[PDB]
Amino acid sequence: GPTFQDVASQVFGQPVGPDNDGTLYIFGLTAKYTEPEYVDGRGPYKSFLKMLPSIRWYDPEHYWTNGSQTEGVFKNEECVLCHTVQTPTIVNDWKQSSHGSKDIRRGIGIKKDGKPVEDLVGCADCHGNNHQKLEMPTYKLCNDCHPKETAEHRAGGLGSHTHAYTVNVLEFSWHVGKPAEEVTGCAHCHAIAENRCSGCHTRHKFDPAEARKPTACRVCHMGIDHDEWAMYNTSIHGALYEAESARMDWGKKLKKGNYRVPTCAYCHMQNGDHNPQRFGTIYSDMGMFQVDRGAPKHKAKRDSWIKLCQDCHSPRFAADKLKEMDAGVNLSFTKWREAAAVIVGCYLDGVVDPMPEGSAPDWYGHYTFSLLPGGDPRFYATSNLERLGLEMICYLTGNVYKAYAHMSMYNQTYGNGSAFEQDRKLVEIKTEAAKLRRFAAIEKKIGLEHKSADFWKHGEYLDLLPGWKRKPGDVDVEWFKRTDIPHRANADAGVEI
Amino acid sequence: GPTFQDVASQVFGQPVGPDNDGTLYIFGLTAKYTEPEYVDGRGPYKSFLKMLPSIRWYDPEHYWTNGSQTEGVFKNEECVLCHTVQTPTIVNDWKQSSHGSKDIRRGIGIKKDGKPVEDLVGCADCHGNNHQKLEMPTYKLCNDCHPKETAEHRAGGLGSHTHAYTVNVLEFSWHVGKPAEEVTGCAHCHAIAENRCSGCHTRHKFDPAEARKPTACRVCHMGIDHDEWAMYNTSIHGALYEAESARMDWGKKLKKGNYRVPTCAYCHMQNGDHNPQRFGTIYSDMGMFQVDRGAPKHKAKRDSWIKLCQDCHSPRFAADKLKEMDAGVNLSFTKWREAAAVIVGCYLDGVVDPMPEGSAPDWYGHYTFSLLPGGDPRFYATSNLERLGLEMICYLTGNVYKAYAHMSMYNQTYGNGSAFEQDRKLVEIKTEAAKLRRFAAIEKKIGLEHKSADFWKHGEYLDLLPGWKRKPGDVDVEWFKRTDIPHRANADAGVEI
Amino acid sequence: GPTFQDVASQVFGQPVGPDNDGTLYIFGLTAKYTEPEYVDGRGPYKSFLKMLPSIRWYDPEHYWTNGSQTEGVFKNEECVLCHTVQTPTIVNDWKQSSHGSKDIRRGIGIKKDGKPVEDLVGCADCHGNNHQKLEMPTYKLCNDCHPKETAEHRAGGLGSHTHAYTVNVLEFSWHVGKPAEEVTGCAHCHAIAENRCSGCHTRHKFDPAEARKPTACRVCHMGIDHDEWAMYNTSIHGALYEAESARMDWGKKLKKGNYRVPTCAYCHMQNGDHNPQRFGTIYSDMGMFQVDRGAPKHKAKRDSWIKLCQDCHSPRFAADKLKEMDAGVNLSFTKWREAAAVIVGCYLDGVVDPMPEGSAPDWYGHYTFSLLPGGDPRFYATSNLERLGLEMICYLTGNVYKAYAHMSMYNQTYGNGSAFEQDRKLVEIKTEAAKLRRFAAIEKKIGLEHKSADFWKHGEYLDLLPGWKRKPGDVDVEWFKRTDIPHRANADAGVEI
Numbered sequence A, B, C: 001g002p003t004f005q006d007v008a009s010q011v012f013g014q015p016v017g018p019d020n021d022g023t024l025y026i027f028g029l030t031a032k033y034t035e036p037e038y039v040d041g042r043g044p045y046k047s048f049l050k051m052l053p054s055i056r057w058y059d060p061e062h063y064w065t066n067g068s069q070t071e072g073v074f075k076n077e078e079c080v081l082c083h084t085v086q087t088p089t090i091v092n093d094w095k096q097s098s099h100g101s102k103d104i105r106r107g108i109g110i111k112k113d114g115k116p117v118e119d120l121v122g123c124a125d126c127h128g129n130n131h132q133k134l135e136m137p138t139y140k141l142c143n144d145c146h147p148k149e150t151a152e153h154r155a156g157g158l159g160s161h162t163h164a165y166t167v168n169v170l171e172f173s174w175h176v177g178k179p180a181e182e183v184t185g186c187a188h189c190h191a192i193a194e195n196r197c198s199g200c201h202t203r204h205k206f207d208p209a210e211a212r213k214p215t216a217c218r219v220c221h222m223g224i225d226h227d228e229w230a231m232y233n234t235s236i237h238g239a240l241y242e243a244e245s246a247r248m249d250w251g252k253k254l255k256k257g258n259y260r261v262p263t264c265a266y267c268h269m270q271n272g273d274h275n276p277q278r279f280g281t282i283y284s285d286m287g288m289f290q291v292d293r294g295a296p297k298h299k300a301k302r303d304s305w306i307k308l309c310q311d312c313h314s315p316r317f318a319a320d321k322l323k324e325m326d327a328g329v330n331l332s333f334t335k336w337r338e339a340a341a342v343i344v345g346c347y348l349d350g351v352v353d354p355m356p357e358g359s360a361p362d363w364y365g366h367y368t369f370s371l372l373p374g375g376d377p378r379f380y381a382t383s384n385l386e387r388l389g390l391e392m393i394c395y396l397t398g399n400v401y402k403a404y405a406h407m408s409m410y411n412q413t414y415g416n417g418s419a420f421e422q423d424r425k426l427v428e429i430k431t432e433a434a435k436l437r438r439f440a441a442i443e444k445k446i447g448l449e450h451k452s453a454d455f456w457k458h459g460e461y462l463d464l465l466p467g468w469k470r471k472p473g474d475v476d477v478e479w480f481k482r483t484d485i486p487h488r489a490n491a492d493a494g495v496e497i
């Protein structure tokens, strides 16, 4: 047959053409997908992983090249004079930073190669002197003068800023399983957290006072799968932050007695610690793994949290609130286990439409049920039942923990990522399960041989997925053998981990 | 058969265990639900209602006990010196309050037992002197020195702060029908509103200027069933609040001419009135009950609102806006009545899956259709059709009123709790109704005897519901006989009301 | 049969009555819809289009009449003295404006009829002197003294403020297809943008500093079909705006070097240009039409945007970010084209329930499939399949463009209006398609003659739609013949356009 584009073209009277030629396609009906220019992605799936070339800014050690048209070797004060015209805000930021202004320096005692840094730290000191060999830095630059903050930034485990990109982008199913341009933001968000020092105190002011605000975290720590910004913002702490932000002193260091209202940085970067993951009781895959943080074996962590709350509360009150979290989280997993039983039950009875063999292969190249061991739990290229299952465990159950951890009365109960949203999801899942069972029971009785539709398996998007290209020997298992970084438990890792 | 936990345990290789032992359960699959320690709940369902012990902070008259390890009888200045170390922000707050600072006092003329309060009001004056008999106060303390504000705080009817917990937690189906730990936030949110004086001007600063901001209300007045924060925030008033908050004078009293931008407190706590419910035309169960507030019988209320708007507008303009609300609300109920007709029609024809007898009993212990008289309208432990019905009347139709009342052009039409969301919900409900009817018509013709799945009735969560435990003589009807408080019209009340 | 109201009345014991009599109807069950008082709407559908009378404030040239009870001809200083009592904030605003205060004037050189305006511009100068002939102005007043800003405000094409109401309310299907009171906010939002000069710098302060903030745009530029506020707010620009709003100098003019953080006005009202649409590459029906803005034919626009970003960035970085937008948008249309193929496929096979003839006629008066040429793509009064289709193209695919254009890493990928939301919608659409196909295949095999339910066609709301009233010769085609305004491509336009 002819393409969907060809039919639509003859109906709307617009010719079929490539999507990238500048034509304004009516509802994008007659445009054909073209493959963007890619560069090869890194990690264990490097044989087929792709990035857009703009990865140069975020993993510059491996991708950065000269792309400037301006030639010359310059001195710091020449960088400033020309960029005052060419990129004025970069200079205005830098002039308002300690790097570019001695007047706002605090005599911290910054050293490079054992010697005190008493001059201005200018454009050339961070980027180089030669305009045809300009450098785009990572934390490795900052380490030259700020080793303490850098060592802590690099001290986290899996699930922290430290391995956000190197492990949790390059090894992650939802990233490696999709066309590169669909998930550019994933690479960049996670890479900004890992490879940069500007995620909280932005360039070029590098102002710690900015870093202390919730705005230093919420661009990443938000949304459907980890809604801690909204949980915080809908707690009484969050409301007080909004009430007091304009007039409170953000210049004070994060320490006991310096703040009325706690922020993300206050509780998680306690006393300026740049390894914010370490105060957490235990890594729980964003609350998808169940754990009672109030159990005897986690007493030192619970006591540490109680003492943190004791900056501004009774410890009895804090201990009660954290016990409410434990109880609320444990109740929330009963609804997930119900949902799981219903979903896997449909699979075992063979009533799921489509069954795994009726869909496009998963990112491993397998036709495996997503909510079984070895499968890829997901929201795309799968059945409605499986999608609703992923949404139950990831979007809702994990966020119930976040709602309790951040004292959002509403989002624990009624709101986004709450108990009542779990209820409603559970009804959806049972509804989908009942539909599937009634169709199968009818089709059996009348002897109708049901075959799942082709649109579950093929389509313009589904045909782009890398699951189709997967073959034996396409995994770089040496990557997974590495012990200097942790790893995800991928089904095709091929080694221990 | 063996449990879901037992199967999952043998598949993932993690042993089955209690949820509360500290083990990190893989997707919470092999964890068993344990019942948290409870204390008995109050109200008409006290025979089985439970609370977590942390209810001590929110209903302290009935639950507060000594839990301190520090001994001694102290004087105010000793409270301050030690707490300066132990809970520094409480002291910093108190020092910045009128209670703890004579310099910021306004000479209001506060009296206790007829005599002027000219000293500092310290920790011991509110909490007691003996550290083993410390008191956790309610409005009953505040009444000693602030009788006007307390009398107004206690002057509201059902649906106000005055009875938020005593009636609308202890008598409410969605609270009494669920395990206590699932709805801790409900008890606390509603109890903070009723029993405390810190919901708007927080402890320990007790700053009225903080209370005047929308942040004093939005932690409670938000979300899917009452989205007035979002309605306000997406009106031009809300945008102007965000624009002017940082530089406007919040120190001015709530009165005509003192503010450009109106806030929740400005319109609802008119002239500092602590009974904000009373300016409302009529209680309407969060807009779930239809009423034309522009009808001749509500003229005094409509005129009062028009005059409130006239602080900053033409009364003709205000009268027009409030007429738009009346018209928009009346249009919105046509979609609800359509939806109701479709839903109850499915019930009358017996095509709802599950039918009420196929689900777990409701919180009364009955197998009754949720959208009939005597039933419990809900979003959980019920059919998809009934869930979608509850969402239509409560989440959407009630919020259309809120969108119009707060001048949110977008949320009246496109947005959350809008006309267009009602449309989309109505399509969902008709869709569910059509599916149910087509399955029933097929099953009838081929003689398939459909029985609703067991997962509608039993499951790890569904088995915890109190509907199973309900028996004759388990209601404290003496509670419902009380005339000093209003009551909800519960089906098992047993008395008049 | 008797009405739904009559049945409910006999069950709840509340009498049937009109919705507008002031009665508090229990769940609005026994209330009857009454038609509000209307005035005739303007435009090509004037034969049946209606507005509420409050349209007087928003299209005053055609609807404004005297409605004051105060008589007299007054001088400016008499307006102020009385309104200081009657509408105090209007006077307080005006006193704080350049119109009412010479001290804050900047010597701009404002002229009327060629002569300098050196006096105060008072109430009477904008509204008239006679209190029984008071005027409610449009931009036509402002033009007297501010011709530059007015000429630019009137310079936009279709899709801009310039024709928001005159074309995109009066000619739009979703407005003309619904009862007037349901879409009052649509008329007003779009009319405020077109006919007023107070949408960004509100009356009566008319402060440009207020206009520069994102709060000057977000009340309109938000939500499910155009979520640029949320896209901006969840970018690092948005977080920095929230961090710096309170202490930054909003008094500075929108120009290169005056701001660290860019706002809507900064990027779209470049250098104070009051035709913000013109910087856009090409109008794309809110991103529903596909276009590669990085193609050679759009180089001048892409270069202009790169140079705008170069106020604060490298142009290489800006060029890369805008290329990511192009790639991300082009990937997003593959999912829409899949969805479209599935949806129209169901129509061609005749398995859509209801089919177009089973629903109420569309707003043209036709029984036409909404996602075919000549149809009306919509979310209401249509099938679930068609609703989900509209949601795919309008709410999601169009917002992917908005997410990329505003650098929201999260909303490009996980969040509202993202790639992953498209995925989940695509699964919903395929799910609905599979249900429809399985019902049709079963019904065919057993010889069951399915007729779509009556609730798809009739109901209390559906019966109000103007599709029922449409007849030949009810379109004012002379309107569509006009060349001084652009037009929408409506199926019943009757002329070229």
Ligand code: HEC
Residues within 6 Å of the ligand: A097, A098, A099, A104, A105, A106, A107, A108, A109, A110, A111, A112, A117, A118, A121, A125, A137, A138, A139, A141, A142, A143, A144, A145, A146, A197, A198, A201, A206, A207, A208
């Ligand atoms: C040495 C050559 C430097 C390099 C390389 C970087 N920084 Fe720096 N930094 C340097 C000095 C001498 C100081 C001032 C110390 C003082 O006495 O005040 C700073 C300070 C900062 C700060 C704090 C700024 C503030 O206003 O308080 C930050 C947040 C900071 N520096 C960040 C930082 C980053 C992220 C770097 C890598 C990109 C980096 N600096 C490198 C000297 C040097």
Ligand code: HEC
Residues within 6 Å of the ligand: A214, A217, A218, A221, A228, A229, A232, A233, A237, A262, A263, A264, A265, A266, A267, A268, A277, A279, A280, A281, A282, A283, A284, A286, A287, A293, A301, A305, A405, A406
């Ligand atoms: C102190 C009052 C808090 C504030 C303010 C914020 N968070 Fe928090 N968070 C807090 C606790 C007590 C916990 C649970 C830790 C435990 O082990 O008991 C959390 C947890 C999180 C997490 C998950 C960490 C993990 O699972 O180990 C994240 C990602 C997180 N918090 C984010 C976060 C952000 C971005 C904040 C500002 C919006 C924020 N938190 C503030 C307590 C406190």
Ligand code: HEC
Residues within 6 Å of the ligand: A108, A139, A142, A143, A146, A149, A150, A153, A161, A193, A196, A197, A198, A199, A200, A201, A208, A209, A211, A212, A216, A252, A253, A254, A255, A265, A269, A271, A272, A273, A274, A276
């Ligand atoms: C958020 C998660 C951050 C990231 C990532 C990094 N920094 Fe940071 N920094 C952050 C905060 C909230 C503050 C204030 C902490 C406080 O105690 O109040 C800081 C501060 C700094 C400083 C100033 C240190 C001083 O002695 O005053 C420096 C020099 C600094 N940060 C360095 C730095 C570098 C090199 C980082 C990456 C390599 C980096 N920070 C990341 C928050 C966050």
Ligand code: HEC
Residues within 6 Å of the ligand: A159, A168, A169, A172, A174, A175, A183, A185, A186, A187, A189, A190, A219, A220, A221, A222, A226, A284, A285, A286, A287, A288, C409, C410, C413, C414
């Ligand atoms: C920034 C805007 C984000 C985007 C875009 C996505 N991710 Fe993310 N992710 C982000 C945060 C702040 C969190 C931590 C939440 C916490 O409570 O820990 C995460 C976490 C993950 C994980 C862990 C999943 C699990 O094992 O539990 C991974 C593997 C992950 N994120 C990867 C990732 C990818 C590749 C994304 C799109 C393909 C995705 N994230 C989007 C922040 C952001």
Ligand code: HEC
Residues within 6 Å of the ligand: B097, B098, B099, B104, B105, B106, B107, B108, B109, B110, B111, B112, B117, B118, B121, B125, B137, B138, B139, B141, B142, B143, B144, B145, B146, B197, B198, B201, B206, B207, B208
């Ligand atoms: C008497 C022994 C007191 C009791 C008990 C409580 N308060 Fe009080 N309050 C008291 C004084 C003498 C004043 C100052 C009056 C003056 O001249 O200014 C106050 C003031 C307040 C205020 C206003 C604070 C402000 O800065 O404007 C508030 C909001 C307040 N008080 C609250 C309040 C609450 C909630 C109480 C119970 C918990 C309470 N007070 C008790 C004296 C006394």
Ligand code: HEC
Residues within 6 Å of the ligand: B214, B217, B218, B221, B228, B229, B232, B233, B237, B262, B263, B264, B265, B266, B267, B268, B277, B279, B280, B281, B282, B283, B284, B286, B287, B293, B301, B305, B405, B406
């Ligand atoms: C004045 C300009 C208002 C502002 C600012 C806020 N609200 Fe409001 N609200 C206002 C009106 C005219 C109405 C309808 C009253 C009527 O009888 O006509 C409402 C109503 C509510 C309600 C429901 C009250 C009831 O049904 O009786 C609530 C719960 C409410 N408003 C909450 C609320 C909050 C929290 C506000 C700030 C975010 C807010 N309102 C501001 C007018 C005004």
Ligand code: HEC
Residues within 6 Å of the ligand: B108, B139, B142, B143, B146, B149, B150, B153, B161, B193, B196, B197, B198, B199, B200, B201, B208, B209, B211, B212, B216, B252, B253, B254, B255, B265, B269, B271, B272, B273, B274, B276
């Ligand atoms: C929100 C709903 C509030 C609750 C609950 C209570 N208060 Fe309040 N209070 C509130 C506001 C918005 C303000 C300012 C009002 C104004 O006119 O601008 C106040 C103020 C007070 C004061 C100061 C009174 C004075 O004469 O200046 C007091 C003493 C006070 N409030 C007492 C108080 C107590 C005792 C309450 C509970 C028992 C209480 N308030 C609750 C908002 C709200």
Ligand code: HEC
Residues within 6 Å of the ligand: A409, A410, A413, A414, B159, B168, B169, B172, B174, B175, B183, B185, B186, B187, B189, B190, B219, B220, B221, B222, B226, B284, B285, B286, B287, B288
């Ligand atoms: C604070 C964060 C809340 C949570 C948690 C829940 N409720 Fe609530 N509720 C809250 C407000 C501000 C409103 C008033 C809205 C208005 O327009 O009136 C309500 C209202 C109710 C009602 C009335 C229902 C009806 O009769 O119309 C009740 C009975 C109720 N709320 C109870 C309640 C319970 C027990 C909750 C969880 C089990 C629930 N609420 C959550 C604020 C908050």
Ligand code: HEC
Residues within 6 Å of the ligand: C097, C098, C099, C104, C105, C106, C107, C108, C109, C110, C111, C112, C117, C118, C121, C125, C137, C138, C139, C141, C142, C143, C144, C145, C146, C197, C198, C201, C206, C207, C208
């Ligand atoms: C002439 C009779 C006027 C008419 C009619 C309107 N405006 Fe005006 N405006 C006028 C003067 C003399 C000035 C001050 C010029 C100066 O020297 O400063 C203004 C200024 C404004 C501004 C800027 C205000 C600021 O504080 O910077 C705005 C935003 C403005 N005017 C808006 C405006 C609108 C929307 C009008 C129609 C409703 C309007 N003006 C009419 C004189 C005159």
Ligand code: HEC
Residues within 6 Å of the ligand: C214, C217, C218, C221, C228, C229, C232, C233, C237, C262, C263, C264, C265, C266, C267, C268, C277, C279, C280, C281, C282, C283, C284, C286, C287, C293, C301, C305, C405, C406
């Ligand atoms: C500069 C940094 C931006 C800021 C800040 C805001 N927007 Fe934007 N927007 C920007 C670009 C580069 C684009 C794409 C233009 C192109 O042709 O490449 C957009 C587009 C929009 C649109 C659609 C315009 C069109 O399709 O022609 C709208 C409606 C829009 N932006 C709204 C908007 C608002 C309200 C903003 C503040 C919240 C905002 N933008 C800020 C870049 C920038």
Ligand code: HEC
Residues within 6 Å of the ligand: C108, C139, C142, C143, C146, C149, C150, C153, C161, C193, C196, C197, C198, C199, C200, C201, C208, C209, C211, C212, C216, C252, C253, C254, C255, C265, C269, C271, C272, C273, C274, C276
């Ligand atoms: C938002 C889309 C706006 C609308 C609609 C109109 N104005 Fe505006 N105005 C807007 C901004 C963001 C600013 C500041 C621009 C800057 O360069 O920083 C302004 C400013 C004005 C001014 C002051 C001009 C001066 O010389 O200082 C005037 C006189 C003014 N605007 C007039 C005006 C009128 C007459 C409009 C409608 C007819 C109007 N503006 C609409 C934003 C927006």
Ligand code: HEC
Residues within 6 Å of the ligand: B409, B410, B413, B414, C159, C168, C169, C172, C174, C175, C183, C185, C186, C187, C189, C190, C219, C220, C221, C222, C226, C284, C285, C286, C287, C288
């Ligand atoms: C203000 C609160 C709005 C409401 C209410 C509705 N509309 Fe709107 N609309 C608004 C904006 C800011 C945008 C521009 C988005 C951009 O990226 O261009 C629009 C756009 C439209 C369109 C164009 C549709 C298309 O051809 O692509 C029209 C025809 C339209 N809006 C009409 C309209 C009507 C009549 C509404 C309810 C019936 C509706 N809008 C609500 C802002 C707002």
